């Protein structure tokens, strides 16, 4: 019975997967090992507990007697550990969240219903580290699947409207603080001009209004630069899109993904507005169709509004496996572009499910 | 002897915004204003605009007719009842708009004179009377992206905005307000975070505790990605604006297309836009920075750096400024003539008011 371990599950990624594993009965063949760096050699609360102790994160002797680890921990995590427990003999499956390994020849990206074929030829030809992409190319490649399964996408322009959650859960409450903090001193009486100015000043205060770990306010605010700066001008979360895509359909011929990554007032869904360049002109009806038939969890929205506003949007999709996409329309641009917009959830099929899917692939 | 001018549309926020921009500016110095009201008539209203007397009937056509140049920040339904109703009657003096309504109509000049002052100039001289401010996306992008235009370097643009709810209405705004208020109260920082989330998502979605029916759905930790009404083409009518405004005030022989998608955001007052450029010649980046820096003097470049993006390319920073901030200007992978960049400036004034000022000013010249 394969013994696999978990990194990563007290934050958001890991609850979200904890929980999809609950409700799709995925212990039931394996015997999970909890890891941690806290309450070490303690019985966890919740469901955990029915696996035993707590076992040392840092330990690599414990972690080396798992067959499958699979960590949500983080990049610095992955960094400072993986090589160690190669270097130290193990050869069990590496699951990762984190984006350090991505690129690798000896890594393959995970998302089973664009490249389950694919998975399985890697475990085959004894592959061993499995790395869930950017949520960025793991919510768009889903939306945009019935088009790129028929290799009809030349390239593809995406602005994104990005959710806290994917900088992690201190990133969201001190946006929710934000928020609170504002609230209370915006006050109903003032003239409106002038309350927008005093929200705006205050939130300009780092010792009033907590911007440390957004850098500056969020709320009622827009931020264009996620994560490190590139050389070519992108920031690295607008890099990773093109070459993960490539990586990910294995493509003998480059698509470019290219745009700007944005962070917005959003709790856990990730928005994207999508300029697509076809391989050849097709009638918006046909576009629409291919798109519908990409997965199960592609859910066209038609193009009005009482739907768009009520189906397209981070309310109506956060919590949910649905990958919406609507306003698909066709362009002024050229003849061959067409528009569409998307939403789906940071943590679910952004972080959490394609790791639980190909946990599965794997032990089976 | 000296110009009559009446204003209509003043007290709500283009309205203040552009009163506050008069002032500023002297603009009232050489000219008779009038203060047109639909409520208050006849009483002196408090504020600066005592000094020019008793408010006068919006609706009334006979104390209109006589305004050399009338200027309306009151929205199109009012320009729907009047406007015609003074041509009718025989009035042949300016009117300048903020509302959409006249913005396509031949006799029509619409108003953005750092790129067609040239053009204001010849309409008024060739006995033209109608001046109207675009809507704010296109004002907005026009200006930051000048420099490209005026040379006439631009084949294409792709812009997705991230619209703030300032371009919707005062109450719209208090709306929003309103919703991220109520949401804050009934948030718990001792529940967990996953848990919050889920509360307040189920909370947004009740409209008899949340009020959305300025919003029609909760803005609040929300995005809309719909502005307007529907088009046949697929667009919405906010989206179809843009191109065929941006083709007016340029007037172009060759049409440039102008797509993407318009997006209400939680801002309040700046309007953010994410800009893909395709040019009609290949230039390096540091042309296209330079070209851009040289648009107007309102165009202000913002390197290409996070310290700097997250300090300065935002609606925190820019609301209330006449700033045009422009940034992350990229090449990109897409094609060797397309560039990337993000953009953001204040709705209500060169979105909406400012422009307004400025042509009263060619006019009343
Ligand atoms: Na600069």
């Not at 630069?225 to 001008?233: A, F, L």
């Not at 944005?262 to 576009?287: D, F, G, M, N, Y």
């Not at 002024?332 to 599965?360: K, M, S, Y």
Request: aromatic fraction near 6%.
């Amino acid at each position: 019975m394969l013994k696999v371990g978990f990194i990563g599950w007290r934050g958001m990624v890991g609850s979200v997967l904890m929980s999809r594993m609950i409700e799709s009965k995925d212990f039931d063949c394996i015997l999970p090992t909890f890891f941690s760096t806290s309450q070490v050699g303690q019985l966890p609360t919740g469901f955990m507990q029915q696996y035993g102790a707590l076992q040392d994160a840092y330990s690599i002797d414990q972690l080396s007697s798992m067959d499958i680890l699979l960590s949500c921990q983080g990049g610095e995590y992955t960094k400072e550990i993986h090589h160690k427990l190669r270097e130290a003999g193990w050869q069990g499956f590496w699951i990762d969240a984190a984006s350090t390994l991505r690129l690798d020849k000896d890594s393959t990206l995970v998302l089973d219903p664009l490249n389950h074929d694919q998975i399985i030829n890697a475990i085959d030809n004894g592959k061993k580290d499995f790395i869930g992409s950017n949520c960025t190319v793991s919510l768009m490649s889903l939306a945009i699947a019935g088009l790129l399964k028929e290799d009809l996408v030349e390239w593809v322009n995406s602005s994104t409207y990005q959710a806290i959650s994917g900088a992690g859960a201190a990133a969201m409450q001190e946006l929710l603080q934000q928020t609170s903090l504002l609230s209370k001193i915006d006050n109903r009486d003032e003239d409106i001009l002038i309350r927008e100015k005093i929200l705006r000043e205050l939130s300009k205060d780092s010792s009033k209004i907590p911007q440390q770990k957004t850098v500056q306010t969020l709320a009622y605010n827009l931020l264009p630069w996620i994560d490190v700066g590139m050389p070519s001008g992108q920031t690295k979360e607008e890099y990773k899109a093109a070459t993960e895509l490539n990586k990910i359909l294995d493509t003998k011929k480059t698509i470019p993904v290219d745009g700007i990554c944005v962070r917005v007032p959003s709790l856990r869904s990730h928005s994207q507005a999508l300029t697509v360049k076809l391989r050849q002109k097709l009638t918006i009806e046909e576009i629409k169709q291919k798109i519908s038939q990409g997965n199960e969890w592609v859910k066209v929205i038609d193009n009005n509004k009482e739907d768009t506003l009520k189906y397209l949007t981070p309310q109506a999709n956060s919590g949910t496996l649905d990958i919406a996409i609507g306003r698909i329309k066709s362009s002024l641009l050229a003849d061959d572009i067409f528009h569409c917009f998307t939403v789906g959830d940071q943590l679910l099929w952004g972080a959490a499910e394609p790791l639980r899917r190909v946990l599965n692939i794997i032990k089976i």
